[PDB]
Each structure stands twice: as C-alpha cells, then as structure tokens.
Amino acid sequence: MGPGFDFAQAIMKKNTVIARTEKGEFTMLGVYDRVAVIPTHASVGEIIYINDVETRVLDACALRDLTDTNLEITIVKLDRNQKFRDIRHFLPRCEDDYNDAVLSVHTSKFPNMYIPVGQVTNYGFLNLGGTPTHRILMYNFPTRAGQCGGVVTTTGKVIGIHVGGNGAQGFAAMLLHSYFTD
C-alpha cells in the first residue's frame, strides 16, 4: 500500500523460507549465504524442513548476551544448494526505538501476511514464557500464535523477528549487524 509495505515485500519475496521443526511451522529469515535465523523455541535439531524439503543443519547456535541471558535468536546454517541475497547492510548496528514498522509472515496458515504495527519501543527485559530474555522490541498490536519468526522491518531496515505476545502487545528479538560478522 506504501513504501513500508514495499520494503517488507522485497525482503519476504527473496529472503524468507518456511521452516518446519517438531515444534511447528515458522517464518525463517535468510540473512546471507546459507545462514538464516529462527526463534530459539523452534528447537532446531540435526534435520529441519525448508519449503517442505528435508535439509541437514550444518550448525545451530542459540544466542545469549554476555551476562548469559537468552536473546531468543538461533542462527542456523543450512545444507542448502542456493545462497540467500546478502541483506546484512539492512541490519541496525545498535539497540534502538523505531517508527512505523511492518510485521510480515509467510506460512501455510498465513501466506503473504503484512501487519502495520506502528511505533516499536526498545523494551529490553521480558520474562518470555518464563525465560528471562534481553534485547526485546515491543509493538502495541495483539499478534497471535503462528506469527513467530515474522520479520519486523522499517523503510530501509530489518530490525527483528517476532518471538511472542501477551494478547495486547507483540514482542520481537533484535537483529544486530554484529550477530552476522563472518
């Protein structure tokens, strides 16, 4: 409908796959080469389904900050025959607040879904499903089950992946450029 949705659509069309684990179907953001991200509660194992194709996991790392607190991001390297478009230059370098964000989801249940969520707060600490979690972004939109792994964007930036909600608010884990230095 406008330039926010335009940027969101460009990321969804080239940099997402549908990931399936024993814990469900998730939107998965490809970042560069064969490296992607997914919420840690997806419980990635040695094998994952990517667009319904059986795929070996070459590496998976559940990120924690330097205080050994959960960040809810798992970085996965996939034994896939094709690289993602490199989108690391769209990642923010520091923790920040944002205006006018879009949450975009692509699953069997919610295809081609875009949600304008408005203002995004640097919320910080969240008790997420009983797990102390840091670097949480918050938006005042009643996001529901199935939208986990959803990409949060602004015009020109990919800022986070959806990891939960409380029925009134939705929460995303920050993506930072420093996670994907190779």
UniProtKB/Swiss-Prot annotation:
Subcellular location(s): the record lists: Host cytoplasm
Which reactions fall under this protein's catalytic activity? Selective cleavage of Gln-|-Gly bond in the poliovirus polyprotein. In other picornavirus reactions Glu may be substituted for Gln, and Ser or Thr for Gly
| The organism's place on the tree of life at top rank | Viruses
List of catalytic residues? H41, E72, C148
- Peptidase C3 domain: from which residue to which, for each copy? 2-180
Can you state the subunit structure given in the record?
Interacts with host IFIH1/MDA5; this interaction inhibits host IFIH1.
Reported function: Major viral protease that mediates proteolytic processing of the polyprotein. Cleaves host EIF5B, contributing to host translation shutoff. Also cleaves host PABPC1, contributing to host translation shutoff. Binds and inhibits host IFIH1/MDA5, thereby inhibiting the type-I IFN production and the establishment of the antiviral state. Cleaves host MAP3K7/TAK1, resulting in inhibition of TRAF6-triggered NF-kappa-B induction. Cleaves host TICAM1; this interaction allows the virus to disrupt host TLR3 signaling. Cleaves host IRF7, resulting in inhibition of type-I IFN production.
- The name this protein goes by in its record: Protease 3C
